[PDB]
Design a protein around this ligand. Structure first.
Ligand SMILES: OCc1cccc(N2CCCC2)n1
Length: 209
């Protein structure tokens, strides 16, 4: 059972700008997604201080980067707080409405796309390199869900039946045909060293078979 939702007009407009604006510094997508993972891990670590049982779904707080040349996918896995169904459908887009308006006014005032993180909508930078994005997420208070969008103004949400995750978020980037450089180990290493060297969680870059 797959539910289809329309993006808010502002979010759909933001995704279209990201996809259609000529902008060569696409590598900032990884910094934005790692930053999102670090924030999600900060939240579950803080919540577990006053409630240790919140880590029953997993004590390890880490980030994994998994490239797959056969599927042409780059997966960013974290064991952070995860996202509920209400987050995927309502809460995140509601928060992102103000940030999108501020971001686009800034772009008209001379800012560039790499500053998208300062407006709270860095997740959508994934569409600089991905034609489709799948998000598998599990929050302690909800079920495991699969969020998916190839842009175009709509996204889907379903209950995920795949391998259980315990807790956290998995962002699967189905890369565009000309963006396969972000599957190479040397390239991912360079980006992490350049933009995410001081993230306070272990980042493990998986290598390919
Ligand atoms: O709206 C902004 C935003 C920030 C972080 C994550 C996110 N997601 C949309 C659904 C998948 C996850 N959106």
């Amino acid at each position: 059972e797959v539910e289809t939702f329309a993006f808010q007009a502002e979010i759909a407009q933001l995704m279209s700008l990201i996809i259609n604006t000529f902008y060569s510094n696409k590598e900032i997508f990884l910094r934005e997604l790692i930053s999102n993972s670090s924030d999600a891990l900060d939240k579950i670590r803080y919540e577990s201080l006053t409630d240790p049982s919140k880590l029953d779904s997993g004590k390890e707080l880490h980030i994994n980067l998994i490239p797959n040349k056969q599927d042409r996918t780059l997966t960013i896995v974290d064991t952070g707080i995860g996202m509920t169904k209400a987050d995927l459908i309502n809460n995140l887009g509601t928060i992102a409405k103000s940030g999108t308006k501020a971001f686009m006014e800034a772009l008209q005032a001379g800012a560039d796309i790499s500053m998208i993180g300062q407006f709270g909508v860095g997740f959508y930078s994934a569409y600089l390199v991905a034609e489709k994005v799948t998000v598998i997420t599990k929050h302690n208070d909800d079920e495991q869900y699969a969020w998916e969008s190839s842009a175009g103004g709509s996204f889907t949400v379903r209950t995920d039946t795949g391998e259980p995750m315990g807790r956290g978020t998995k962002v699967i980037l189905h890369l565009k045909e000309d963006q396969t450089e972000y599957l190479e180990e040397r390239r991912i290493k360079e980006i992490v060293k350049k933009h995410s060297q001081f993230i306070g969680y272990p980042i493990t870059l998986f290598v390919e078979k």
